[PDB]
Each structure stands twice: as structure tokens, then as C-alpha cells.
Design a protein around this ligand. Structure first.
Ligand code: AOS
Ligand code: AOS
Lengths: 148, 148
């Protein structure tokens, strides 16, 4: 399974830690940058990860900024993307079980490293439950079709 | 200002509490439902609040479900909406200061009542900081325009 990862300078150090964690577990990782601490704009990297997920070049993505908010809002602008900002494993599990999220968003200034690794572990392992959740995901798709 | 609020059955009881909190503080509140514990679909209510914010009929909105994730992802599919799922006051403040969020998303199964009122209080008071944050918000607008 291939994981795209991306961040602004606010999520860069946590991104390096997560890239390292994911490889150790045998995931293939595509790092879309950013590639240092220089100030950059979270929507550009949100977009790269979200577009790699939409095109099937990654199966899912993880996006990181100070809070997770900006980069996840930007990712969710892409039709077919469901980016979930999670600050605990319960939200991470539900985002997979219920929302079928294909992007996990994290905030490097909000969650400490080991908590964020717990969240990523939970999210990678949880599974979509279909049923009424698929119905609701289709209704998300109807919003996208409306404003397309 | 006027605040739109909406929820599925997962966010209904916390919605009733926040509506009451907001009125006590002299805000005008437009409740978009849901109106009971009957099982309903979070995208429908996310859309109502998001479209009311987009059309200026509300100035800001608050959307609530079990986790906040699904309804905020749905809200974010609307162009001009920036829905922030917050689990603490720090995220709520940053979502205003940096992301100029015009919808707050909460999860009734994740944050307890007093924490959620703290977050709402923080979010309603925080102010957009412009500058490089305005630039980044514009780049979110470029994503919208691309998939429009
Ligand atoms: O949404 C903004 C992100 O959290 C950034 O990581 C943050 O805004 C930082 O202050 C860059 O100026
Ligand atoms: O995903 C949907 C929301 O969190 C709901 O509030 C919840 O999942 C519901 O129990 C499912 O029917």
C-alpha cells in the first residue's frame, strides 16, 4: 500500500518522523515535500497529496501542518478526497470506519510525536464499514457534483 | 452576529446545549436541524449550514456530529467555506487567526460539554490575522476554482 505524505514548514519535522515510521513498517512512501523549515504555503502541499490520492498514484495520504486544519481544508476541496483532522485514535478509527477517509491530517503543534504515531497506526489499520456510511459518503459526493 | 447551527442525531444534544449557550449571550441563532434523535445523514445538515454561511444569511456556522469529521468534510465541499474540526481552544483560535474559518465543527462523542463550550467561546472571539494567512486562504480559493 502506498502512502503519500506532505506538509508545510509547521508539519515538516513530524513529517520526517512519520516517513521513517511508515518505511520501518514496509510501506512505500512518496514524500511530496516540503523539504525544509523555510516558510511555505500549506495549500500547495495539501493539493499535491490530495491529487496523488485522486489519481491512484498513492492509495492514501497523510498531511501535516501546525494544527492540521489549513492543509485538510485545502485537501477536501478536491472531489473524491475525504481528509480527516484527528487528535486522538478514536477519531482516527472512526474516520476510516465511517467516513472512509483517504487522507489523515495532523497538527505538529497540537499532538506530540508518540500520540501522532498512535493515531497514524490506528488510522492505517482501521477499515471502512460501508452500509449507511457508504450512503452518507455518496451524499458528500452529491455536494461535490453540485459545485463542480 | 448570526450563527447557523446544524447536526446529525450524533450531534443533536450538544447542538441543543450550544443553541442555549449562544442565545444567553445574545447571538441570533438559526437552527437548521436535525430536530431529534432519529437517525439522519450528516451531509444534509452540513450543507444547510454551509449554504447559509455562503449566502450571508448566517455570518458563521457551527456543525456537530459524533466526531465532527463527516459534517465538516461535507461543509468544506462548498466553495468559500472553511470548516475547522476543533477538539481544543488552541485549534479553535488558530482556525480563526490563520484559516479564517467560518464554520466550527465539533464531535459530541469526542469533547464533553464544558470543553465544547470553551471551544465555541474561544472560536467566536478570535480574529483573522490577514497577511500571509490571507495569501494562503486565496490558494485554497485556487483549489476551488480549479475543480469548479
Ligand atoms: O494553517 C497554518 C499552519 O498551521 C502553519 O503551520 C502556521 O500558520 C505558521 O504560523 C506559518 O506562518
Ligand atoms: O459518521 C457519522 C457521525 O459521527 C454519526 O454521528 C454516527 O456515525 C452514527 O452513529 C452512525 O449512524
Amino acid at each position: 500500500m502506498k502512502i503519500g505524505i506532505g506538509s508545510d514548514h509547521g508539519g515538516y519535522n513530524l513529517k520526517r518522523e512519520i516517513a521513517d515510521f511508515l518505511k520501518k513498517r514496509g510501506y512505500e512512501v512518496i514524500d511530496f515535500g516540503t523539504h525544509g523549515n523555510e516558510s511555505v504555503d500549506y495549500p500547495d502541499f495539501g493539493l499535491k497529496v490530495a491529487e496523488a490520492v485522486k489519481s491512484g498514484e498513492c492509495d492514501r495520504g497523510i498531511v501535516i501542518c501546525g494544527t492540521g486544519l489549513g492543509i485538510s481544508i485545502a485537501a477536501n476541496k478536491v472531489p473524491g478526497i475525504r481528509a480527516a483532522v484527528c487528535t486522538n485514535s478514536y477519531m482516527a478509527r472512526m474516520s476510516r470506519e465511517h467516513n472512509d477517509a483517504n487522507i489523515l491530517a495532523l497538527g505538529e503543534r497540537v499532538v506530540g510525536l508518540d500520540l501522532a504515531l498512535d493515531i497514524v497506526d490506528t488510522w492505517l489499520k482501521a477499515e471502512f464499514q460501508g452500509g449507511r456510511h457508504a450512503t452518507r459518503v455518496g451524499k458528500i459526493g452529491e455536494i461535490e457534483k453540485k459545485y463542480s
